[PDB]
Amino acid sequence: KFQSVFTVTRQTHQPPAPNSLIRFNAVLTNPQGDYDTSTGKFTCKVPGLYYFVYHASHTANLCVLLYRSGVKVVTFCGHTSKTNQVNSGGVLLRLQVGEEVWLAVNDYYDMVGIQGSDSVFSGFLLFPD
Amino acid sequence: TQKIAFSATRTINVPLRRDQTIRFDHVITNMNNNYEPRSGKFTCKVPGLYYFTYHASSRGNLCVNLMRGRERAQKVVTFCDYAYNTFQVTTGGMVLKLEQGENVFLQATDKNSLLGMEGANSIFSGFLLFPD
Amino acid sequence: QPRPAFSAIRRNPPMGGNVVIFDTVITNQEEPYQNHSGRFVCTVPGYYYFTFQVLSQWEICLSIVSSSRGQVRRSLGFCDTTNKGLFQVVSGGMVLQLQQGDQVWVEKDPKKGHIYQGSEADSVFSGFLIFPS
Ligand SMILES: [Ca+2]
């Protein structure tokens, strides 16, 4: 399409590997196939202004980093001991065709949410160009 | 065709005072340049519906007031999130119908534990949903 | 053109049931959101984004639920189980493709449903159309 939207989730009990890209394997919505579950990366098809946001459940320290074409854009960290909390983050980015966007973790990589608390990553095109 | 959006982070290393307009000096995005880094305020040029949001890293108790208004600002809501001897990232958001000349911004409170740095960001964003 | 968008908060909510009712409207373009029931009603088919930031001091688990043809569709959950008596904001959100008549709302887990009631701070439920179908 001439639009772009996705909401993916991480469905697995094992957290990501430290200092690695966060893979979201399950899809709630992804009509253009912009987010690739095989690589864990979003790749721009339609240029323009996008909004990216995530809500990640964790029961130990977790820092989520948003990358845009190899560059770390933002980092948000949440610390917790045994109990469950939600780490959230987001940013507006004006992207060009082919640009990749993904989330990653650093040494703080926990994404083991308690039964009933999930992790989601959404993205959608707001202004075409 | 009115493409309006902004995302700015706080990198200034200085504490927040009570009732102080929280400034996000570092701009990542500022389409239509309706957001001002120097003040941390968004000023409506094109009236309409907007969505405003933020994610604040913090090392303690934090409360923020979302503000709206023209020459006199008023508070829409207050977002509070506490942390006892630990680090946190909190968030707030709001859809607001804006008139030309009105400005939206975040204002610090008595709970001012807010971190603005590499590896622990604090960001403020806003975008136009539909033009009036 | 359609401009469906809303934000509602809590102030004087009717308690009872697991549906979380955000009684006080800040914005409600095209009145999709019913402040009396806590439910959003889709008029314009398309992709919408919904999100919440709810305040708790103990244990809370929330989910954005929807319905189509009266059929309830359970979804993702988001919790905060700090349980220390201090303010904690649980947040969550997602894009939902809705058809005319579909309803969206936030539901709490009956065993973990503590939501702050007061004037110190606020809980919000927001939603808006991303693009029509
Ligand atoms: Ca907290």
CATH label of the domain that carries residue A67: 2.60.120.40
Length of chain A as a residue count: 129
Cα dihedral C48/A85/A12/A52 (nearest 10): 40
CA–CA separation, A20 and B80 (whole Å): 32
Nearest-Cα distance to chain C for B50, in Å, is 9
| Residues in B 26-55 with any Cβ partner in A closer than 8 A | 28-29, 31, 53, 55
Q: Are C49 and A122 an interchain contact pair (Cβ–Cβ within 8 Å)?
A: yes
Q: Are A80 and B5 an interchain contact pair (Cβ–Cβ within 8 Å)?
A: no
| Total structural domains within chain A | 1
The answer to whether residues A120 and C93 touch, using CB atoms and an 8 Å cutoff, is yes
Q: List B125's β-bridge partners, or say none.
A: B7, B53
Q: Are C78 and A6 an interchain contact pair (Cβ–Cβ within 8 Å)?
A: no
CA–CA separation, B83 and B60 (whole Å): 5
Q: Are C26 and B90 an interchain contact pair (Cβ–Cβ within 8 Å)?
A: no
How many Cβ atoms from other residues are within 10 Å of residue B33's Cβ? 12
Phi and psi of C97, rounded to 5°?
-90, 120
Provide CB contacts within 8 A for C18, sequence distance 6+.
C107, C108, C109, C110, C113
Q: Which residues of C touch B76 (CB under 8 A)?
A: 26
Domains observed in chain C: 1-133 (2.60.120.40)
Q: What would the two tokens of residue B29 be?
A: 């995005």
Instruction: Provide the sign of the torsion angle of the four alpha carbons A58, A63, A67, A73, taken in this order.
Output: positive
Q: What would the two tokens of residue C70 be?
A: 């009266």
Nearest-Cα distance to chain A for B6, in Å, is 7
How many Cβ atoms from other residues are within 10 Å of residue A89's Cβ? 27
Q: Which residues of B touch A129 (CB under 8 A)?
A: 3
Q: How many CB pairs under 8 A join A and B?
A: 77
Whether domain B1-132 has CATH 2.40.160.100: no
Q: Are A55 and C49 an interchain contact pair (Cβ–Cβ within 8 Å)?
A: no
**Furthest CA-CA distance within chain B:** 48
Pair type for strands C19-20 and C103-113: antiparallel
**Which of A71, A106, A126 to probe by mutation at the B interface, max B CB count within 10 Å?**
A126
CA–CA separation, A88 and A63 (whole Å): 10
Experimental method: X-ray
Q: Are A124 and C91 an interchain contact pair (Cβ–Cβ within 8 Å)?
A: no
CA–CA separation, C28 and A27 (whole Å): 29
Give how far Cα C85 sits from Cα of C81, C92, C115, Å. Answer: 11, 21, 11
Provide CB contacts within 8 A for A91, sequence distance 6+.
A51, A52, A66, A73, A74, B7, B28, B29, B123, B125
The answer to whether residues B115 and B57 touch, using CB atoms and an 8 Å cutoff, is yes
Provide CB contacts within 8 A for C37, sequence distance 6+.
C19, C21, C105
Q: How far is the CA of B82 from the centre of ligand 1 (A)?
A: 4
How many Cβ atoms from other residues are within 10 Å of residue B26's Cβ? 16
Q: How far is the CA of C87 from the centre of ligand 1 (A)?
A: 6
**Which of B51, B58, B91, B113 to probe by mutation at the C interface, max C CB count within 10 Å?**
B51
Q: How far is the CA of A89 from the centre of ligand 1 (A)?
A: 14
- B10-17: long-range contacts (C-beta < 8 A, 24 or more apart)? B10/B40, B10/B114, B10/B116, B10/B121, B10/B122, B10/B123, B10/B124, B11/B116, B11/B117, B12/B116, B13/B116, B13/B117, B15/B112, B16/B108, B16/B112, B16/B114, B17/B108, B17/B112
The answer to whether residues C102 and C7 touch, using CB atoms and an 8 Å cutoff, is no
Asked if C131 reaches chain B (Cβ–Cβ under 8 Å), the answer is no
Range of the domain at A53: 1-129
Give the start-to-end residue ranges of the domains of chain B.
Answer: 1-132
Q: What would the two tokens of residue C47 be?
A: 């992709």
Asked if A122 reaches chain C (Cβ–Cβ under 8 Å), the answer is yes
**Amino acid residing at B45:** K
> Resolution of the experimental model in angstroms, please?
1.9
Name the closest residue on chain C to residue A114, using Cα atoms.
C79
Nearest-Cα distance to chain A for C49, in Å, is 9
**Amino acid residing at B63:** C
